[PDB]
């Protein structure tokens, strides 16, 4: 249930496990636990040693070079809460250079209230990616897990699936397991942080992590807010005071701690705001009899004597040592070599300080974006100055944009000069505003504030260029802007025009194709755009190019980003036009929209025309042998630019020298219209007719069609059943001299055309004789004519051949010629 046993204030273990035995009798640690520097150990020295009593750690847990420890699943099988009241370099769980360890095994760790987890330099550590840190840490982006076995090698990660829940981390679901036999326990989304039981029921409202019986304050293993007599209470009832932000104690305990600190070598505790805190804030003072800090009758701040008068702030734990300070009797050096924004915690710890007796220095702070976390910074006395007599040193800040909000923030610097260098996103305007507001205007000398390094990567020209005439065409956009001239008009070397297609409105500032425009002659400068893709929205803005002057302000002029969209035109030809015949009167045509819509494709056009059969085939004697009828770069380095600057400056220098020397100051076809379809069914089609399909993608219908050439494809229907079959009875004639002349009605409506006829006559008992009848032969002889037949009874069968192929035979016809 709740916490039994001692409290064991945070301890450190070194060089052996002999002193590690003092963790047996306590379940909660009121401090930090460090196991580190353990070289003469073997893996058999940890199996027999276990600490199931440990439940929660207030400050942090640090493991550093403990040889022989392979998994923490034996050492801490009941660790569930790390409050993180005091961190270790903004980290609450650090595992560094922990050789001979394979898996964490902390399968009961559920919530880490404050801080992050850093795991680094563990060549044998696995089962790292199989942990859902988002269920434990509020901010998972602040973690740092690099240089392990997971990325150096491909060690196996066997999470039991036949049970380990799976949750998507980036775009795929992966099972979660602490070890090869322990799945990471996941609570339902309804249980935010109160924890869930074995069957998946939310615990008590003021519970956290795990519980024995749901909805029971006295059956929880970790109170979310406060602990008191085995029960979690939202606030400590009287006469119990909040102590260490995790438990409530009576007046006797706080008084005993105060007396023990007073009568010995310390954290001399006091009482304020129903709490037993180490020291009451500014404006309060503890009394003799009782420990409560009553408000003082005067402005007495809480001065914080900084050792050596120069304190470097590089972490949350280093900043936390100034918590509650209002006047600093030393100097501050803000140096966060990070990559993640610490402003949230830094403003909570710092920002309550009013005056700084020394200098304030911000050096190589990569992650800082503003100095606004100094909420109540007013006075910088600067009684102790940086080398070179400086009272404010900003250097090499990669992302410092604004120093303060000068609308409502006041600042005062008594002594010392200023310094600014290599702040690519801090502009000179902010520095000069600080000069004016602080009161150190006439105190800086040359090169104390650089010009080529401050704001050289930020566009802060603080002067507006206004476009005057923009006109749009098919692929050309004409731009015109009002002319601009610096006081020395020869400084203007031209304009730079930045253009980029913008699918949506929200576009950044500062791709981005550049074109240089020469300055005008003294007619708006303007520029015309070439080679644009129709029906596209582009982002246009102009930034001036002016010569640097080392003495005064560099110069400034630029235009706000405007959005222009080129108009529409004719679209492209549809791609992949394929026609398939599924019936003798139906063909299906399939296509895709063109790759260049040039607007919204509104409809399609399909045109039909029949291909007349070739007259060549009608006039051939196919009975002849050989009757095989077909079965139908960037600017050249810097030298370039420099050279142009140098030439322009040389011309200006010669002009100035000449003016100095000279002047002396004396004293139709079927069609249809598709509507938002990519396929169409065709009906009313003649069998075996070459159909030439003209397909268009057209995006304008009523105000005249504006659309390009068409795609062409041919299709032919399937053969019919009895189109080639010969109809009509066969008529035969026998002349005086036994001449056989046949008459048969042709298939008047055939599959295109009939190429030949075949007559097969066989006498009863004899063999079958064949004869080919050609088109010209049929036209001339009106059927089949045979010469010199032996007397007897024959059987006449006729077939017709067309472009489809072989036609069905006719019914047998019998004729008998006289034997004379």
């Amino acid at each position: 249930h709740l916490y039994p046993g001692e409290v064991c204030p945070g301890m450190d273990i070194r060089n052996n496990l002999t002193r590690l035995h003092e963790l047996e009798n306590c379940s909660v640690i009121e401090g930090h636990l460090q196991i580190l520097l353990m070289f003469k150990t073997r893996p058999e020295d940890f199996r027999d040693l276990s600490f199931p009593k440990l439940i929660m750690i207030t400050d942090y847990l640090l493991l550093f070079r403990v040889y022989g420890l392979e998994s923490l699943k034996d050492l801490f099988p009941n660790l569930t809460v790390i409050r993180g009241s005091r961190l270790f370099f903004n980290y609450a769980l650090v595992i560094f250079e922990m050789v001979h360890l394979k898996e964490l095994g902390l399968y009961n760790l559920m919530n880490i209230t404050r801080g992050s987890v850093r795991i680094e330099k563990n060549n044998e550590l696995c089962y790292l990616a199989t942990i859902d840190w988002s269920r434990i840490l509020d901010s998972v982006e602040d973690n740092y897990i690099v240089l392990n076995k997971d990325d150096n090698e491909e060690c196996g990660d066997v999470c039991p699936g036949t049970n380990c829940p799976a949750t998507v981390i980036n775009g795929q679901f992966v099972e979660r397991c602490w070890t090869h036999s322990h799945c990471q326990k996941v609570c339902p989304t309804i249980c935010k942080s109160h924890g869930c039981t074995a069957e998946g029921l939310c615990c008590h409202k003021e519970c956290l992590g795990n519980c024995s019986e749901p909805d029971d304050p006295t059956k929880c293993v970790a109170c979310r807010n406060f602990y008191l007599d085995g029960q979690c209470v939202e606030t400590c009832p009287p006469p119990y005071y909040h102590f260490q932000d995790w438990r409530c104690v009576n007046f006797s305990f706080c008084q005993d701690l105060h007396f023990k600190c007073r009568n010995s070598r310390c954290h001399q505790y006091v009482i304020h705001n129903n709490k037993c805190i180490p020291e009451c804030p500014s404006g309060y003072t503890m009394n003799s009899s009782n420990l409560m800090c009553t408000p003082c009758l005067g402005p007495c701040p809480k001065v914080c004597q900084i050792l050596e008068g120069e304190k470097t702030i590089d972490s949350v734990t280093s900043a936390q040592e100034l918590r509650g300070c209002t006047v600093i009797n030393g100097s501050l050096i803000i140096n966060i070599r990070g990559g993640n924004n610490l402003a949230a915690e830094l403003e909570a710890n710092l920002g309550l300080i009013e005056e700084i007796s020394g200098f304030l220095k911000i050096r190589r702070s990569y992650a800082l974006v503003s100095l606004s976390f100094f909420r109540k910074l007013h006075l910088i006395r600067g009684e102790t100055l940086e080398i070179g007599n400086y009272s404010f040193y900003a250097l090499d800040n990669q992302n410092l944009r604004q120093l303060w909000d000068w609308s409502k923030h006041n600042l005062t610097i008594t002594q010392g000069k200023l310094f600014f260098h290599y702040n690519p996103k801090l502009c000179l305007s902010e520095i000069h505003k600080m000069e004016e507001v602080s009161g150190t205007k006439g105190r800086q000398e040359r090169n104390d504030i650089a010009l080529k390094t401050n704001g050289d990567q930020a566009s802060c020209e603080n002067e507006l260029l206004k476009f005057s005439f923009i006109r749009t065409s098919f692929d050309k956009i004409l731009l015109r802007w009002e002319p601009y001239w610096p006081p020395d008009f020869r400084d203007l070397l031209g304009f730079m025009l930045f253009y980029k297609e913008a699918p949506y409105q929200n576009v950044t500032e500062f791709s981005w194709t550049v074109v240089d425009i020469d300055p005008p002659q003294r007619s708006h400068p303007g520029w015309l755009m070439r080679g644009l893709k129709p029906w596209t929205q582009y982002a246009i803005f102009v930034k001036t190019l002016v010569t640097f002057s080392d003495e005064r302000r560099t110069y400034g002029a630029k235009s706000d980003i405007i959005y222009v969209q080129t108009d529409a035109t004719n679209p492209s030809v549809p791609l992949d036009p394929i026609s398939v015949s599924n019936s003798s009167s139906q063909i299906i045509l399939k296509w895709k929209p063109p790759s260049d819509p040039n607007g919204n494709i509104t409809h399609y056009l399909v045109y039909w025309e029949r291909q007349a059969e070739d007259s060549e085939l009608f006039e051939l004697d196919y009975c002849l042998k050989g009757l095989k009828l077909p079965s139908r770069s960037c600017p050249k380095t810097d030298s370039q630019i420099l050279k142009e600057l140098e030439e322009s400056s040389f011309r200006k220098t010669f002009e100035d020298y000449l003016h100095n020397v000279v002047f002396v100051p004396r004293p139709h076809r079927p069609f249809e219209k598709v509507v938002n379809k990519e396929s169409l069914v065709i009906s009313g089609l003649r069998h075996f007719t070459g159909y030439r399909i003209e397909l268009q993608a057209c995006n304008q219908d009523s105000p005249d069609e504006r659309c390009s050439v068409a795609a062409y494809v041919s299709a032919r229907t399937m053969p019919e059943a009895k189109a080639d079959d010969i109809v009509g009875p066969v008529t035969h004639e026998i002349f005086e001299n036994n001449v056989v002349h046949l008459m048969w009605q042709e298939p008047k409506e055939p599959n295109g055309l009939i190429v030949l006829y075949e007559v097969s006559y066989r006498r009863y008992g004899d063999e079958e004789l064949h004869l080919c009848v050609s088109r010209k032969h049929f036209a001339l002889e009106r059927g089949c004519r045979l010469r010199g037949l032996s007397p007897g009874n024959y059987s006449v069968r006729v077939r017709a051949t067309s472009l489809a192929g072989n036609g069905s035979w006719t019914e047998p016809t019998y004729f008998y010629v006289t034997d004379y």
Binding site: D12, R14, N15, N16, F39, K40, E97
Partner: peptide, 27 residues
């Protein structure tokens, strides 16, 4: 042997220098 000790090399140098007595930490 006198040279710059940085990173893990510092830990190794201390471990060869001492470790039979053990590292020190304030009580």
């Amino acid at each position: 042997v006198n040279q710059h000790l940085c990173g893990s090399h510092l830990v190794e140098a201390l471990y060869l220098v001492c470790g039979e007595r053990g590292f020190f930490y304030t009580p």
